[PDB]
Amino acid sequence: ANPHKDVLKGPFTTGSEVTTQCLTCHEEQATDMMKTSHWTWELEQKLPDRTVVRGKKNSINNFCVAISSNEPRCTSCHAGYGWKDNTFDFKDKTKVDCLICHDTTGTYVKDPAGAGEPMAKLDLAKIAQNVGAPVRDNCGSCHFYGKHGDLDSSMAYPDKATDVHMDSDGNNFQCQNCHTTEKHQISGNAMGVSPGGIDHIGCENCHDSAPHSNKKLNTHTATVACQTCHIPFFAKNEPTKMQWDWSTAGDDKPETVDQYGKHTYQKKKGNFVWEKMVKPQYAWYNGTANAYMAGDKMDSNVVTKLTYPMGDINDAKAKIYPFKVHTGKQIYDKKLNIFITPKTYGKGGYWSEFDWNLAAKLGMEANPTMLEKGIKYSGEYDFAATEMWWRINHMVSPKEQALNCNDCHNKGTRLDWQALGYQGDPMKNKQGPKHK
Ligand code: HEC
Numbered sequence: 001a002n003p004h005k006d007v008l009k010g011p012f013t014t015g016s017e018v019t020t021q022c023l024t025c026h027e028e029q030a031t032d033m034m035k036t037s038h039w040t041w042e043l044e045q046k047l048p049d050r051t052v053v054r055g056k057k058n059s060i061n062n063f064c065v066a067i068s069s070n071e072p073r074c075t076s077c078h079a080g081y082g083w084k085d086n087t088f089d090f091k092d093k094t095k096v097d098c099l100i101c102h103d104t105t106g107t108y109v110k111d112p113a114g115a116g117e118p119m120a121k122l123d124l125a126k127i128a129q130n131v132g133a134p135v136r137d138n139c140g141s142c143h144f145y146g147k148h149g150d151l152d153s154s155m156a157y158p159d160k161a162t163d164v165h166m167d168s169d170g171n172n173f174q175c176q177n178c179h180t181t182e183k184h185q186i187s188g189n190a191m192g193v194s195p196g197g198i199d200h201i202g203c204e205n206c207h208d209s210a211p212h213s214n215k216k217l218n219t220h221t222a223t224v225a226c227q228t229c230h231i232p233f234f235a236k237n238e239p240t241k242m243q244w245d246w247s248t249a250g251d252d253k254p255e256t257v258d259q260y261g262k263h264t265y266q267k268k269k270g271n272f273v274w275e276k277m278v279k280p281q282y283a284w285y286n287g288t289a290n291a292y293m294a295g296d297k298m299d300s301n302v303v304t305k306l307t308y309p310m311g312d313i314n315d316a317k318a319k320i321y322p323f324k325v326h327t328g329k330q331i332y333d334k335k336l337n338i339f340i341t342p343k344t345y346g347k348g349g350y351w352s353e354f355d356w357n358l359a360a361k362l363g364m365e366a367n368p369t370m371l372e373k374g375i376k377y378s379g380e381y382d383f384a385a386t387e388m389w390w391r392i393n394h395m396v397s398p399k400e401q402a403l404n405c406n407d408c409h410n411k412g413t414r415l416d417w418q419a420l421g422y423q424g425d426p427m428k429n430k431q432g433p434k435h436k
């Protein structure tokens with residue numbers, strides 16, 4: 001037994017007061033955790049032409065776009081308390097959130113607009129006393145809401161049909177059963193992070209790399225990622241957003257709904273398309289990814305890929321992997337040719353004032369990178385098309401629903417042979433295209 005139940009009677013009125021207790025004995029864990037991306041929101045990433053500091057802190061996406069000037073809404077999913085703008089003290093140990101991963105009561109909740117602060121009226125003392133090993137639902141406080149359509153609210157206690165590894169009646173894995181954690185470094189590669197292992201966890205430390213009695217299926221694994229055949233669908237239980245058109249935001253037309261009660265229009269955000277039971281898109285992937293970074297020039301007559309997997313048929317490091325792809329339109333500076341990071345949340349933000357010029361001006365004056373590069377909002381904006389790629393790794397289906405020969409070959413359409421660089425279906429056509 002540990003001392004928790006005896007030492008943490010409180011009263012506690014704030015998160016850091018809780019944390020300041022945890023540190024009388026777990027200063028090491030804070031120090032360790034603070035070295036990681038869960039605390040800094042930064043990752044180094046090797047792009048085709050340059051190494052950058054990406055991570056969430058520096059990323060641009062086609063959903064909410066970017067954290068700067070919006071921090072109080074976004075850092076409800078930071079393992080910290082108080083990150084509300086650019087003055088956040090990343091060296092302050094009393095600001096780590098120790099409860100979000102370790103709460104066992106199921107009541108600990110971070111206020112969705114509170115810059116990481118817990119909701120009002122929690123029994124903090126009680127939460128602190130009951131702290132223990134994370135389960136799926138702790139990771140899921142940030143990982144099941146917003147997007148990746150492969151981790152849903154039902155991954156809290158999913159069935160076999162949803163995920164064979166996490167299946168609470170079967171293998172019942174917690175996330176760290178695969179994402180092994182040492183010194184609060186939670187293992188697992190985000191897309192475009194390496195080194196010479198595309199997947200740090202992948203499928204091959206618990207399965208043989210030739211796991212099939214059918215040898216022809218084993219020969220495919222040099223080219224086709226396990227994830228491709230074994231995750232035939234994501235968003236199995238609940239719709240995910242497939243498109244977000246910001247260009248239409250700001251009108252008082254009716255805020256219409258889906259088959260599934262999801263909004264297809266909202267004044268504050270624009271138009272959406274939702275989909276349930278989604279086939280992935282397939283692409284060559286060798287462990288590296290391209291990314292759009294703040295300040296990059298772009299071209300509005302074309303779709304901009306905000307991220308994209310690298311590799312191709314001639315790339316011996318690349319395999320065909322499955323991806324979720326989200327498309328949209330979003331705001332760009334019509335004079336510089338760059339995407340803008342606008343203020344949507346809070347005072348002057350789009351969501352209260354519905355004025356894109358003001359949201360642009362305020363979001364650009366708050367962005368550290370724009371400032372670093374002397375970039376000023378020009379005063380003119382427009383909307384441009386984008387696509388963004390995320391890896392699909394969860395919801396492995398039972399073996400009976402793996403893609404089989406006829407999903408890809410013969411009348412199968414899973415793979416777009418020519419987009420992948422093949423000369424027709426390789427089974428009809430043993431002449432032109434082979435991986436390596
Ligand atoms: C000393 C008075 C402690 C305070 C205050 C807190 N914790 Fe603790 N914790 C303490 C000990 C001696 C142990 C056992 C360490 C060992 O391995 O010998 C623990 C254990 C934990 C764990 C592991 C829980 C598990 O089920 O394995 C966690 C996750 C943990 N402690 C977290 C934690 C937090 C968040 C605290 C503030 C709320 C906290 N502890 C206070 C000693 C002490």
Ligand code: HEC
Binds near residue numbers: 055138175188
């Ligand atoms: C909210 C407070 C989170 C909780 C709770 C957990 N994670 Fe998380 N995770 C969060 C963010 C904002 C990010 C991106 C960090 C960045 O800037 O890069 C992540 C990332 C991951 C990753 C990807 C690797 C990485 O990006 O560095 C993994 C593999 C991951 N998270 C796993 C993970 C697990 C297993 C969790 C429970 C123990 C967990 N996370 C909690 C936000 C939050």
Ligand code: HEC
Binds near residue numbers: 186
């Ligand atoms: C998720 C993003 C986490 C945050 C924030 C914190 N911890 Fe953690 N902790 C996390 C994991 C995935 C693990 C391993 C769990 C397992 O099942 O093996 C732990 C482990 C601990 C432990 C025991 C092991 C150790 O390193 O000593 C302790 C004592 C612990 N965690 C405490 C702790 C504290 C005090 C935190 C806030 C400052 C904290 N953890 C944050 C995941 C995450």
Ligand code: HEC
Binds near residue numbers: 391
């Ligand atoms: C094995 C059976 C897994 C379980 C259980 C969970 N995850 Fe996972 N995850 C797994 C793999 C093979 C990968 C690819 C990365 C690798 O190094 O092999 C991932 C990846 C992630 C990521 C990164 C996704 C991305 O940004 O590209 C995250 C954020 C993530 N996983 C989170 C996560 C959570 C929250 C889980 C519990 C609900 C979880 N994973 C379980 C394998 C496995």
Ligand code: HEC
Binds near residue numbers: 214217228230
């Ligand atoms: C499609 C081209 C596949 C690739 C690539 C991989 N697998 Fe597969 N797998 C596929 C089928 C059609 C089936 C069902 C047929 C069967 O052998 O049952 C499977 C099955 C498995 C299983 C279950 C094996 C059994 O007990 O019968 C496992 C454990 C498994 N596959 C794992 C797996 C891994 C780890 C892969 C990458 C190394 C992999 N498969 C590739 C189709 C395809």
Ligand code: HEC
Binds near residue numbers: 177202227398
């Ligand atoms: C260990 C940490 C694992 C990792 C990482 C992955 N898999 Fe797994 N898998 C694991 C176990 C213990 C089991 C059950 C095996 C049994 O004896 O019943 C499985 C099961 C599968 C299956 C079979 C599902 C079924 O129909 O019963 C498949 C097809 C499978 N696993 C594939 C798979 C893939 C593609 C993974 C990477 C994303 C993966 N596994 C990771 C252990 C672990």
Ligand code: HEC
Binds near residue numbers: 405
């Ligand atoms: C998609 C995810 C597939 C499934 C399911 C199956 N196959 Fe496949 N096939 C796929 C690719 C991407 C390739 C090219 C591999 C390469 O070397 O570049 C192939 C290739 C073949 C071939 C021609 C090569 C050969 O092995 O002689 C054959 C005859 C073939 N595939 C047959 C086959 C069968 C019988 C399958 C079911 C067990 C099967 N494939 C599944 C993609 C996919």
Ligand code: HEC
Binds near residue numbers: 055061065074141144
């Ligand atoms: C929890 C419910 C979240 C809230 C609220 C917000 N975000 Fe998030 N985001 C969350 C996680 C767990 C991750 C890591 C995903 C992984 O699989 O590795 C992220 C990541 C981002 C990124 C990086 C690129 C991407 O995956 O889209 C960006 C640019 C981003 N998030 C932006 C963002 C903004 C602007 C938010 C508030 C307005 C916001 N997020 C809230 C989880 C959660």
